[PDB]
Design a protein around this ligand. Structure first.
Ligand SMILES: O=C1NC(=O)/C(=C/c2ccc3nccnc3c2)S1
Length: 839
């Protein structure tokens, strides 16, 4: 239709990819998926209530942390209901409801309405305690006053959606392979390797005679396998690889309609470079112009009580209580299997139990599917994200195992889906098929909530504009989401995508007009400013929503405050004005555009940091972390949130001494001066101690605590925070300037440094209580976030770091040891840091 085809062009521009393309495809799994996601989209949109969907109340059922009550020791909240002039400050109770609250206002005013926060697209509605709104806790945690404005409920009419209406051994013939360009140094040979895979696990492997690596190499040789056609499990993967490893490609032997792949195929392959999630994609290489290829032929159809002793039961248990990174063995597996009804009564044993299943045999898989049939213990157990996330990684390809995994996620409330959305989304790369429990689950949660949906949009978009391996799949999941969020949501995303395109065009140009040789010369300096105008004209929207912070709505770009950070690279530093007039602060909005870093690795790292707070919180601890917003929007490019009143530590040093040259007291001077009243400098020391320990533990477990001062920042208010995360040693950073702030010197004691270790070990062991969770996220971050890593050696770092095994009491000491190693280096390495880091 003249406009229907027009709408698709819209969704296409938003999505950054053309789902309506069938150029790079060899079947119809995608279309079937769009076809298939239509249902899930429909059930949810219909189900979602406009009354709450249009205001996305953001709340939690978790208990208000123990470190957030001193604020309210009078069981009285100081909400400050605004309006237009009369800002009456009502008093409510930590239990009152946005309804009751509206009462203590109209009850205090005499002779519909909703209370959204001032300067933010956040409403405080819904039958939920005023203490269960993340905002109220945000205000309580920052000493800020809980404000709010009396305004009418948003016309839900806006959340309007456009109208919607054999028992033979497996065989495989390798015809040959081809590549346009040949002339490559060596005159070596090459062979093809066909592997039948299921969950990383190879179930068979066949090769080919080493023929010379010429422009074209035909083999016309059948590759007979041992596995029988009735044993190939759903999810199985024919992994073709070229060795001389330089090229790989995959092809599911069992389609989406439960049929066995049969026919001629010309697969364009991915190039390798010298484990990670890309080697797993069922996608073919889009660039059929200069990429290796392989012709194969497929032609061969539906789909297919005593009690453990005591000593052995003592053996099974020792297996169960082991980290995920600890491999298994022929015996452990046979043990876990033969007693599959025993190990079944233990949820934590599911990952290991399913790793001992011989998927390459119909009979065994058949039994396995019968094991799952009864999930009393699992379905009844408390939700364990660690364990759940484990059944969604690269090791589980059976949809039924993975399926129960999503079954527990179903039990997650928004606030928790926000804490994991990113990894949940990265986990879709492990799914063997496009349409899946996990996708269906992400898609629904997106539609049911505008916050999750906003973040789903960018997380998926991040993958589509950068991942050839997984764009088609993500794009298809995105389009499905876009057709259910609403007309408003669309208007928003559109405005957002436009602003970034241009600001990204500006970003790359400036980087060009500026040589490696540090400059920020008059010229480029005059250029950026000149550039920031050709856009502020009309094209660049008068306003737009902030991708890393959905509430905030940026307006005009304050050219007068925009610049270009030094850095080898040339990140851009932009600032806008809040498009909301009801704001009660002068604070503009600072976003940092940059090119050069894999801004995805950053995202993941900040994601983990928010998961380390959440943990610390449940254990009543607060290490004041500042995981700033960051959204990767393309290959080596994205945006960064700008924390107000923050300075690099290095600059804090060279702000008293010299350049090339470190006064241990430089920091304590900055804090006292950059602070009005002493009552405040006291605070600053407080927030500095907590957040300081915070990045100490966190950065350590992650193995990213050895960084040059230039990547460490602090605020005039006391909060410190690391930055830059895209990839004499040391644990972390506890330099004399910090140590000094706490009040200490070479080997000493203090009311603060004592607090420092006091807060650390407590937060550290707290993390140790989530060893398995941390390991799994960690292990998923490498597989989808970093190049290609050994499925052992690289993940193993997290295992030694978190010191799995050791008794708490020891670890309690282990940390401190690492702490003393600090003094041992004083300014050693920090002074050294100019060279480089490796290994
Ligand atoms: O990877 C990276 N490359 C860069 O240039 C970075 C700079 C940066 C990051 C966060 C900030 N937050 C508040 C203030 N200033 C900031 C500066 S991070």
């Amino acid at each position: 239709s003249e406009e229907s085809q027009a709408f698709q062009r819209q969704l296409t521009a938003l999505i950054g990819y053309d789902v309506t393309d069938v150029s790079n495809v060899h079947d119809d799994e995608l279309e079937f998926t769009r076809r298939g996601l239509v249902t899930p989209r429909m059930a949810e949109v219909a189900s979602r209530d406009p009354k709450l969907y249009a205001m996305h109340p953001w709340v939690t059922s978790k208990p208000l942390p123990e470190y957030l009550w001193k604020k309210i020791a009078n069981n009285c909240i100081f909400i400050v209901i605004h309006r237009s002039t009369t800002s009456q400050t009502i008093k409510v109770s930590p239990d009152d409801t946005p309804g009751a609250i509206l009462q203590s206002f109209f009850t205090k005013m005499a002779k519909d309405f909703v209370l959204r926060v001032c300067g933010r697209d956040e409403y405080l509605v819904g039958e939920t305690p005023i203490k269960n709104f993340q905002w109220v806790r945000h205000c309580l945690k920052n000493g800020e006053e809980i404000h709010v404005v009396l305004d009418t409920p948003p016309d839900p009419a806006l959340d309007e959606v456009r109208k919607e209406e054999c028992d033979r051994k497996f065989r495989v013939k390798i015809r040959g392979i081809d590549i346009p360009v040949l002339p490559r140094n060596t005159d070596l040979t090459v062979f093809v390797e066909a592997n039948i895979q299921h969950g990383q696990q190879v179930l068979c492997q066949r090769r080919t005679s080493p023929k010379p690596f010429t422009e074209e190499v035909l083999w016309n040789v059948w590759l007979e396998f041992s596995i029988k056609i009735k044993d190939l499990p759903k999810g199985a993967l024919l992994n073709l690889q070229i060795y001389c490893l330089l090229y790989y490609v995959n092809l599911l032997l069992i389609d989406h309609r439960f049929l066995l792949r049969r026919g001629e195929y010309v697969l364009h392959m991915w190039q390798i470079s010298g484990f990670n999630a890309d080697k797993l994609t069922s996608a073919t290489n889009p660039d059929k112009e200069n990429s290796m290829s392989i012709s194969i032929l497929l032609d061969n159809h539906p789909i297919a009580r005593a009690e453990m002793p005591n000593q052995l039961r003592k053996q099974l248990e020792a297996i169960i209580a082991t980290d995920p990174l600890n491999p298994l063995t022929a015996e452990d597996k046979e043990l876990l299997w033969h007693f599959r009804y025993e190990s079944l009564k233990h949820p934590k044993a599911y990952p290991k139990l399913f790793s001992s299943v011989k998927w390459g045999q119909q009979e065994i898989v058949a039994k396995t599917y019968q094991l799952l049939a009864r999930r009393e213990v699992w379905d009844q157990s408390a939700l364990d994200v660690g364990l759940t996330m484990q059944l969604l990684d690269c090791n589980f390809s059976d949809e039924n195992v993975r399926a129960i995994a999503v079954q527990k996620l179903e039990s997650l409330e928004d606030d928790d889906v926000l804490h994991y959305l990113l990894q949940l989304v990265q986990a879709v790369k492990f799914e063997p098929y496009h349409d899946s429990a996990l996708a269906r689950f992400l898609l629904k949660r997106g539609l049911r909530n505008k916050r999750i949906g906003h973040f789903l949009f960018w997380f998926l978009r991040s993958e589509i504009a950068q991942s050839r391996h997984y764009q088609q799949r993500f794009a298809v999941i995105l389009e499905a989401y876009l057709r259910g969020c609403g007309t408003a949501m669309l208007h928003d995303f559109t405005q957002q995508v436009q602003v970034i395109e241009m600001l990204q065009k500006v970003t790359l140009d400036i980087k060009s007009l500026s040589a490696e040789k540090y400059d920020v010369s008059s010229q480029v300096i005059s250029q950026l400013k000149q550039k920031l105008e050709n856009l502020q004209n009309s094209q660049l929207p008068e306003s737009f929503r902030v991708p890393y912070d959905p509430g905030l709505k940026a307006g005009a770009l304050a050219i007068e405050k925009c610049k270009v950070m030094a850095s080898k690279k040339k990140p851009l530093w932009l600032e806008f004005k809040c498009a909301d007039p009801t704001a009660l602060s002068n604070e503009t909005i600072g976003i940092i555009f940059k090119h050069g870093d894999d801004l995805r690795q950053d995202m993941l790292i900040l994601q983990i940091l928010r998961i380390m707070e959440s943990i610390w919180e449940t254990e009543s601890l607060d290490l004041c972390l500042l995981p700033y917003g960051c959204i990767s929007t393309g290959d080596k490019i994205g945006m960064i949130e700008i924390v107000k009143d923050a300075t690099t530590i290095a600059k804090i040093q060279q702000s008293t001494v010299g350049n090339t040259g470190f006064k241990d007291e430089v920091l304590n001077h900055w804090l006292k001066e950059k602070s009005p009243t002493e009552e405040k400098f006291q605070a600053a020391v407080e927030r500095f101690v907590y957040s300081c320990a915070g990045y100490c533990v966190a950065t350590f477990v992650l193995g990213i605590g050895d960084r040059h001062n230039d990547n460490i920042m602090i605020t005039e208010t006391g909060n410190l925070f690391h930055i830059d995360f895209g990839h004499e040693r040391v644990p972390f950073v506890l330099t004399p300037d910090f140590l000094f702030v706490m009040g200490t010197s070479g080997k000493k004691t203090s009311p603060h440094f004592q607090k420092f270790q006091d807060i650390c070990v407590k937060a550290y062991l707290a993390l140790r209580h989530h060893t398995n969770l941390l390991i799994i996220l960690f292990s998923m971050m490498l597989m989808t976030g970093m190049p290609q890593l050994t499925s052992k050696e690289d993940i193993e770092y997290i295992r030694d770091a978190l010191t799995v095994g050791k008794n708490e009491e020891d670890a309690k000491k282990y940390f401190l040891d690492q702490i003393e190693v600090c003094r041992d280096k004083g300014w050693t390495v920090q002074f050294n840091w100019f060279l480089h880091l490796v290994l």
